[PDB]
Design an enzyme around this catalytic site. Structure first.
Site, PDB file in Angstrom:
ATOM      1  N   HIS A  41      24.248 -42.202  -1.603  1.00 41.87           N
ATOM      2  CA  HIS A  41      24.484 -40.884  -2.572  1.00 41.87           C
ATOM      3  C   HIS A  41      23.608 -39.720  -2.031  1.00 41.87           C
ATOM      4  O   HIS A  41      23.760 -38.556  -2.528  1.00 41.87           O
ATOM      5  CB  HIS A  41      24.296 -41.200  -3.916  1.00 41.87           C
ATOM      6  N   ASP A  90      25.663 -48.556  -2.224  1.00 40.03           N
ATOM      7  CA  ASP A  90      24.933 -47.259  -2.040  1.00 40.03           C
ATOM      8  C   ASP A  90      23.708 -47.522  -1.169  1.00 40.03           C
ATOM      9  O   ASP A  90      22.567 -47.767  -1.248  1.00 40.03           O
ATOM     10  CB  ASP A  90      24.227 -46.853  -3.639  1.00 40.03           C
ATOM     11  N   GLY A 190      14.279 -38.332  -7.361  1.00 41.16           N
ATOM     12  CA  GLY A 190      13.576 -38.027  -6.335  1.00 41.16           C
ATOM     13  C   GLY A 190      13.179 -39.099  -5.186  1.00 41.16           C
ATOM     14  O   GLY A 190      12.819 -38.974  -4.285  1.00 41.16           O
ATOM     15  N   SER A 192      15.317 -41.725  -4.936  1.00 37.60           N
ATOM     16  CA  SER A 192      16.646 -42.218  -4.384  1.00 37.60           C
ATOM     17  C   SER A 192      16.392 -42.554  -2.750  1.00 37.60           C
ATOM     18  O   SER A 192      15.866 -41.734  -2.220  1.00 37.60           O
ATOM     19  CB  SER A 192      17.762 -41.230  -4.501  1.00 37.60           C
ATOM     20  N   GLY A 193      16.804 -43.753  -2.441  1.00 33.49           N
ATOM     21  CA  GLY A 193      16.981 -43.977  -0.898  1.00 33.49           C
ATOM     22  C   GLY A 193      15.537 -44.764  -0.531  1.00 33.49           C
ATOM     23  O   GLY A 193      15.649 -45.249   0.790  1.00 33.49           O
TER      24      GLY A 193
HETATM   25  C1  LIG Z   1      24.857 -43.618  -6.721  1.00 33.04           C
HETATM   26  C2  LIG Z   1      23.552 -42.824  -7.276  1.00 33.04           C
HETATM   27  O1  LIG Z   1      24.025 -42.793  -8.807  1.00 33.04           O
HETATM   28  C3  LIG Z   1      23.421 -41.980  -9.558  1.00 33.04           C
HETATM   29  C4  LIG Z   1      22.347 -41.433  -9.174  1.00 33.04           C
HETATM   30  C5  LIG Z   1      21.152 -40.762 -10.082  1.00 33.04           C
HETATM   31  C6  LIG Z   1      19.941 -40.298  -9.768  1.00 33.04           C
HETATM   32  N1  LIG Z   1      19.041 -41.120  -8.864  1.00 33.04           N
HETATM   33  C7  LIG Z   1      18.277 -42.219  -9.779  1.00 33.04           C
HETATM   34  C8  LIG Z   1      17.707 -43.256  -8.899  1.00 33.04           C
HETATM   35  C9  LIG Z   1      16.808 -44.131  -9.464  1.00 33.04           C
HETATM   36  C10 LIG Z   1      16.906 -44.058 -10.899  1.00 33.04           C
HETATM   37  C11 LIG Z   1      16.317 -45.037 -11.664  1.00 33.04           C
HETATM   38  N2  LIG Z   1      15.544 -46.259 -11.436  1.00 33.04           N
HETATM   39  N3  LIG Z   1      16.089 -44.839 -13.262  1.00 33.04           N
HETATM   40  C12 LIG Z   1      16.780 -43.862 -13.718  1.00 33.04           C
HETATM   41  C13 LIG Z   1      17.260 -43.061 -13.041  1.00 33.04           C
HETATM   42  C14 LIG Z   1      17.644 -43.229 -11.771  1.00 33.04           C
HETATM   43  C15 LIG Z   1      18.318 -42.077 -11.195  1.00 33.04           C
HETATM   44  C16 LIG Z   1      20.266 -39.309  -8.509  1.00 33.04           C
HETATM   45  O2  LIG Z   1      20.150 -39.426  -7.452  1.00 33.04           O
HETATM   46  N4  LIG Z   1      20.694 -38.147  -9.525  1.00 33.04           N
HETATM   47  S1  LIG Z   1      21.358 -36.719  -8.410  1.00 33.04           S
HETATM   48  O3  LIG Z   1      21.564 -35.884  -9.495  1.00 33.04           O
HETATM   49  O4  LIG Z   1      20.219 -36.553  -7.378  1.00 33.04           O
HETATM   50  C17 LIG Z   1      22.640 -37.435  -7.764  1.00 33.04           C
HETATM   51  C18 LIG Z   1      23.641 -38.261  -8.449  1.00 33.04           C
HETATM   52  C19 LIG Z   1      24.723 -39.001  -7.751  1.00 33.04           C
HETATM   53  C20 LIG Z   1      25.163 -38.544  -6.335  1.00 33.04           C
HETATM   54  C21 LIG Z   1      24.233 -37.566  -5.885  1.00 33.04           C
HETATM   55  C22 LIG Z   1      23.101 -37.155  -6.354  1.00 33.04           C
HETATM   56  C23 LIG Z   1      21.793 -40.761 -11.347  1.00 33.04           C
HETATM   57  C24 LIG Z   1      23.038 -40.968 -11.945  1.00 33.04           C
HETATM   58  C25 LIG Z   1      23.827 -41.842 -10.693  1.00 33.04           C
HETATM   59  O5  LIG Z   1      24.997 -42.351 -11.140  1.00 33.04           O
HETATM   60  C26 LIG Z   1      25.566 -42.289 -12.483  1.00 33.04           C
HETATM   61  C27 LIG Z   1      24.971 -43.555 -13.464  1.00 33.04           C
HETATM   62  C28 LIG Z   1      27.029 -42.592 -12.395  1.00 33.04           C
END
Ligand SMILES: CCOc1cc([C@@H](Nc2ccc3c(N)nccc3c2)C(=O)NS(=O)(=O)c2ccccc2)ccc1OC(C)C
Ligand SMILES: [Ca+2]
Lengths: 254, 55
Positions: A41, A90, A190, A192-193
């Site tokens: 993602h 992912d 932030g 993520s990954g």
């Molecule tokens: C597959 C990734 O999906 C999501 C990814 C995310 C965000 N990451 C994370 C990672 C770990 C989390 C944790 N441990 N706790 C709480 C929250 C957490 C949020 C993100 O990266 N946000 S982003 O806006 O940058 C982005 C999102 C999607 C694609 C590109 C960029 C929020 C929702 C998402 O999906 C829905 C449920 C449907």
């Protein structure tokens, strides 16, 4: 990372920082001198694949201390089953343009065998998650690398211990929950990954990837991580493959 | 044997002909004569933290 601590410099030596046009994009995990594992993602919104940089040996984003090593990302490999804007599968495998040099501050995390990961690592309760993500929900990101110890849940338990939400994604066999439902501790967007690293008999292994959740450290919700054990064979086969022209590569999964 | 307590292996475990078991190690490690322990063969083996190892 919410509710963690600063990772003492050099204690998370496999942590990768990914940058696009010099801006913080995502975390990643170094698994040998040329390969990094991150989340698919992270790449949903990239337009200029040529300005993607991986930084190893990073700790404090405000200063250059000489232990940092930057490399251009030559290839981003994503499973064919991943759909941009959705949560399943992912994972991304990144090939660096030139190997990093292993030092006290740059060391790979062990990518475990599938059997060992499923039979043994999956039963180690606590693991470390790290990154330069948000220190609070709707708060600033960290200048120093942060680390948090989180317990893993069996998926039936995660669904039972979680607060029901509208249009909430399913927790598949390619994911696992870890963390706390009391809103005190979690990884954030932030992060993520980044790695979910598990210790077993004196060595650390890659078991998860910071993937998704509903708001950072939200009461009634756990963090959701990519279940790396499902991708060992897929990763291994790609690492034995010759590079291909073009930065982005979609590779068949399984 | 591998399903129970990792077959006593420090790292990887393979089950063989009946009650036979072979432990194995990740690259950058070698198996000791005890048949279970893994020792580093390189300066920076995976999953070890040098500042902690040297302390
Ligand atoms: C597959 C990734 O999906 C999501 C990814 C995310 C965000 N990451 C994370 C990672 C770990 C989390 C944790 N441990 N706790 C709480 C929250 C957490 C949020 C993100 O990266 N946000 S982003 O806006 O940058 C982005 C999102 C999607 C694609 C590109 C960029 C929020 C929702 C998402 O999906 C829905 C449920 C449907
Ligand atoms: Ca720095």
């Amino acid at each position: 990372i919410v509710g963690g601590k600063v990772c003492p410099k050099g204690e998370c030596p496999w942590q990768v920082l990914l940058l696009v046009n010099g801006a913080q994009l995502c975390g990643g995990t170094l698994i040998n001198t040329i390969w990094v594992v991150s989340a698919a993602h992270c790449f949903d919104k990239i337009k200029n694949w040529r300005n993607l940089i991986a930084v190893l040996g990073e700790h404090d984003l405000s200063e250059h201390d000489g232990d940092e090593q930057s490399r251009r990302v030559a290839q981003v490999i994503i499973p064919s089953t991943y759909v941009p804007g959705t949560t399943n599968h992912d994972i991304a495998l990144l090939r660096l343009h030139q190997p990093v040099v292993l030092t006290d501050h740059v060391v790979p995390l062990c990518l475990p065998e599938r059997t060992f990961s499923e039979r043994t690592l999956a039963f180690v309760r606590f693991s470390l998650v790290s990154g330069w993500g948000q220190l609070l929900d709707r708060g600033a990101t960290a200048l120093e690398l942060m680390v948090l110890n989180v317990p893993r849940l069996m998926t039936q338990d995660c669904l039972q211990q979680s607060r029901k939400v509208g249009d909430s994604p399913n927790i598949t066999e390619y994911m696992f929950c870890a963390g706390y439902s009391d809103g005190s501790k979690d990884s954030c967007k932030g992060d993520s990954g980044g790695p979910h690293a598990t210790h077993y008999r004196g060595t650390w292994y890659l078991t998860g990837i910071v993937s998704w959740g509903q708001g950072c450290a939200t009461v009634g919700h756990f963090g959701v991580y990519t279940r790396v054990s499902q991708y060992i064979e897929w990763l291994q086969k790609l690492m034995r493959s010759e590079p291909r022209p073009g930065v982005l590569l979609r590779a068949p999964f399984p | 044997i591998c399903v129970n307590e990792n077959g006593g292996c420090e790292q990887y475990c393979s089950d063989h002909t009946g009650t036979k078991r072979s432990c194995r190690c990740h690259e950058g490690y070698s198996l000791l004569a005890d048949g279970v322990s893994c020792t580093p063969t390189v300066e920076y083996p995976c999953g070890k933290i040098p500042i902690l190892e040297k302390r």
